[PDB]
Amino acid sequence: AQYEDGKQYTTLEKPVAGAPQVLEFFSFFCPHCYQFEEVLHISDNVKKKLPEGVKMTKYHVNFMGGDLGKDLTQAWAVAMALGVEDKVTVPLFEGVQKTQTIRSASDIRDVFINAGIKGEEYDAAWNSFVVKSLVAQQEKAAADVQLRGVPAMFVNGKYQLNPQGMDTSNMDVFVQQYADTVKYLSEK
Numbered sequence: 160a161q162y163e164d165g166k167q168y169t170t171l172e173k174p175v176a177g178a179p180q181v182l183e184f185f186s187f188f189c190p191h192c193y194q195f196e197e198v199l200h201i202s203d204n205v206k207k208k209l210p211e212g213v214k215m216t217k218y219h220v221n222f223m224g225g226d227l228g229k230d231l232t233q234a235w236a237v238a239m240a241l242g243v244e245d246k247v248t249v250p251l252f253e254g255v256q257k258t259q260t261i262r263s264a265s266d267i268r269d270v271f272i273n274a275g276i277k278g279e280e281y282d283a284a285w286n287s288f289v290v291k292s293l294v295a296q297q298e299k300a301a302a303d304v305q306l307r308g309v310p311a312m313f314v315n316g317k318y319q320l321n322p323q324g325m326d327t328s329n330m331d332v333f334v335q336q337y338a339d340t341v342k343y344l345s346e347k
Contacts, residue, residue: 166324167340171317175303178316179216181205181341184301187231187255188224189309196252199334201310208338209345217244218297220309224255230264231255236293237271237284246274314344 164170183202185192195201206215219235221228231251238244250270254261261267271281284290304313312320325336 162340162343166321167336168314168321168344169319171304171313171319173305175313175316178303178313179300180213180315180345181209181215182300182304182313182316183215183217184220184306184309184311184313185217186220186223186228186309187251187261188228190256192310193252193256195310196248199330201334201337204334205312205338205341208342210342213345216300218300220301220306221298222307223309227261227263230267232297233285233290233294234264234267234271236290236297237281239293240284240287240290241276241280243271243274243276246276247271250274312341314341314347318344318347320344 162168185195202215202217209215219232221232224231234247234251235244238247247270250273251261251267254266254270261270268278268281268285272278304316304319310322314320320337320340322333322337325333325340327333
């Protein structure tokens with residue numbers, strides 16, 4: 160077959176019921192995640208080839224960067240609650256991996272302030288039980304599915320993208336192969 164289990168994707172032994180259609184996991188500490196976001200624009204190119212009626216979800220993980228890692232998972236819950244993902248993703252990646260100006264929760268907060276979210280609004284969000292459950296959702300989803308590595312994408316709680324088995328000679332061709340694989344898995 161042109162698409163083969165173990166080649167562009169793997170199958171979960173232990174399928175996850177009720178799982179989001181396209182579920183992606185990342186960390187702001189994750190170097191391939193940086194690439195996926197700023198150079199390859201994976202999420203965006205997947206969206207463009209997905210049918211419609213299909214929801215895309217993106218969650219942060221705790222297992223990188225210790226204490227700061229958990230703060231970043233809370234901050235991403237804040238971002239999801241406020242709908243400001245698009246405004247903080249780049250400054251968070253660059254503040255962690257490029258400029259290395261993110262070293263504490265207060266530094267994460269600065270990124271939001273500078274992106275124009277108001278202090279009061281951010282801190283109320285940070286402390287809110289709606290953010291608490293959004294943190295739980297991120298954790299449970301990762302727990303449900305094995306997760307010890309990022310970047311990761313899972314389709315319909317059954318299939319996991321295997322970018323190692325795709326060619327990287329041309330970044331453009333890598334991305335299309337990836338997105339086309341998601342489309343294929345989505346129609347499966």
